[PDB]
Amino acid sequence: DIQALIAAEITGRLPTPDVYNDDNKLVIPAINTGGKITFSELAKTQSD
Amino acid sequence: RAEKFVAPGAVSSMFSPAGYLTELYREARGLHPKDSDRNLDKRRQDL
Secondary structure (H helix, E strand, O other): OHHHHHHHHHOOOOOOOOOOOOOOOEEEEEEEOOOEEEEEEEOOOOOO | OOOOOOOOOOOOOOOOHHHHHHHHHHHHOOOOOOOOOOOHHHHOOOO
């Protein structure tokens, strides 16, 4: 039930409705071999 | 070597209906020539 949450957070659409809203950044997980969760983050320049 | 096992009923499985459909389409798509109107790829452009 927590793996379904992490899976729906990487490939689904959770957290509903809007993500990416912590200082123009994002942290998305990446699990591997059933026994570890590693991370990778996103950023952006200031358009708009 | 304990790389990746998936659940029963997952689409990634080698015993899934997706694997059966992949086997079936791979053995099916060459029965009639590509010129023919009875070819599987020509009568169904969604597969």
